[PDB]
Design a protein around this ligand. Structure first.
Ligand SMILES: Cc1cc2nc3c(=O)[nH]c(=O)nc-3n(C[C@H](O)[C@H](O)[C@H](O)COP(=O)(O)O)c2cc1C
Ligand SMILES: CC(=O)C1=CC(C(C)=O)(C(C)=O)C=C[C@H]1C
Ligand SMILES: [Cl-]
Ligand code: NA
Length: 356
């Protein structure tokens, strides 16, 4: 087996092992609604074994950056259906990444100019982009215990909206220091209720969110993404091996589509070595594993052949190469990604990277 082998993901038949990683492109229109241009972008990439669409806020409070799309309104459902229809017409498969940014936001992006919510009242460091340029972060409000059901319900409604939008499945974003990750990691979570302290408490929001989403979706169409060794957004855990190893085992109850690991590119250089080898998680999580982070044809074939992972997601290379699968398959030159046009804007650096 290699990166071009087919794969059975529940009832979905993937033509290859190549996944398009979720990539925020900040190109939503008024009301954070997807539009035709976005449909073209994802349709261009439909040769992917599976596309995971960009992080998409499940509720207004879950937005943290200008012009990211939502999945909380009927108008957003309609705009996403343009996208899933195009991907389906092009013979592809697409899951929606369900987001809530938690503390990584600013009042200017929040309903009524209120505070971002979080497990604990810990201000991120530095500045955050608003509609009026960069502004200092404020301190988020720590959620009351009694409010956690409402967070879980916002994710359940986000998942239901994704189903109405015609996606093939959803991915729970539990990585990169956003809301669920903020609860996971003891650096961001110092709660003294059942959602803080012990690992089974820190993992509780993830597990409750997953349980609610599997009430809407068949479980084999629900994935979870973790990023055990990122330090993005000021979110770190003091015992990542035990924390993430626990989560990989706890998720098995749900019979999920997959577990997706973003392997931080800078982890070894920082952490002075390999704190959480992905093999540790591979051995604990009994389902499909997607791995991600600086993969190539050569690196992806190896992890598949070695049984270290089942699926390989590419982020950066999918920005710049719409036909990435084909290019990898024939060892074609790859287009170089232009960082200047990753976030915001229009067609330039989005739909105008050429096919082979
Ligand atoms: C422009 C850009 C936007 C990203 N947006 C997301 C996101 O929406 N959700 C997410 O989980 N990761 C996101 N990431 C992380 C990527 O999915 C991916 O894990 C990372 O870029 C490493 O993979 P790569 O080396 O193949 O690019 C983003 C990365 C980039 C470069
Ligand atoms: C939503 C998301 O995960 C994003 C990832 C990053 C990244 C990998 O560096 C980040 C956490 O800042 C880039 C863009 C966003 C939104
Ligand atoms: Cl196509
Ligand atoms: Na199914």
């Amino acid at each position: 087996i290699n990166l071009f082998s087919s794969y059975q993901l529940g009832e979905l038949e993937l033509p290859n092992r190549i996944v398009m990683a979720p990539l925020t492109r900040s190109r939503a229109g008024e009301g954070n609604v997807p539009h035709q241009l976005n449909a073209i972008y994802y349709g261009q990439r439909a040769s992917a074994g599976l596309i995971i669409a960009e992080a998409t806020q499940v509720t207004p409070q879950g937005q943290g950056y200008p012009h990211t799309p939502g999945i909380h309104s009927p108008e957003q459902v309609a705009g996403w259906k343009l996208v899933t229809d195009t991907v389906h017409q092009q013979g592809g498969r697409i899951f929606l990444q369900l987001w809530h940014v938690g503390r990584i936001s600013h009042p200017d992006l929040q309903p009524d100019g209120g505070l971002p919510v979080a497990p604990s009242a810990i201000a991120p460091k530095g500045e955050v982009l608003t509609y009026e340029g960069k502004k200092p972060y404020v301190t988020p409000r720590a959620l009351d215990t009694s409010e956690i059901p409402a967070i879980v319900e916002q994710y359940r409604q986000g998942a239901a909206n994704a189903l109405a939008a015609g996606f093939d499945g959803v991915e729970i974003h539990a990585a990169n220091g956003y809301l669920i990750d903020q609860f996971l990691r003891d650096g961001t979570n110092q709660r003294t209720d059942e959602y803080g302290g012990a690992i089974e408490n820190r993992a509780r929001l993830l597990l409750e969110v997953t349980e609610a989403i599997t009430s809407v979706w068949d479980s084999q169409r629900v994935g979870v993404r973790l990023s055990p060794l990122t330090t993005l957004n000021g979110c770190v855990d003091s015992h990542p091996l035990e924390t993430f190893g626990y989560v990989a085992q706890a998720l098995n109850r749900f019979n999920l589509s997959y577990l997706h690991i973003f392997e931080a590119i800078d982890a070894d250089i920082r952490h002075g070595g390999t704190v959480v080898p992905t093999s540790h998680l591979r051995d604990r999580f009994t389902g499909t594993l997607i791995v991600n982070g600086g993969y190539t044809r050569e690196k992806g074939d190896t992890v598949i052949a070695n049984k270290a992972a089942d699926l390989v997601a590419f982020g950066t290379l999918f920005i710049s190469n719409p036909d990435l699968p084909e290019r990898l398959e024939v060892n074609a030159p790859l287009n170089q990604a232009d960082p200047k046009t990753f976030y915001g804007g229009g067609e330039k650096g989005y739909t105008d990277y050429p096919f082979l």
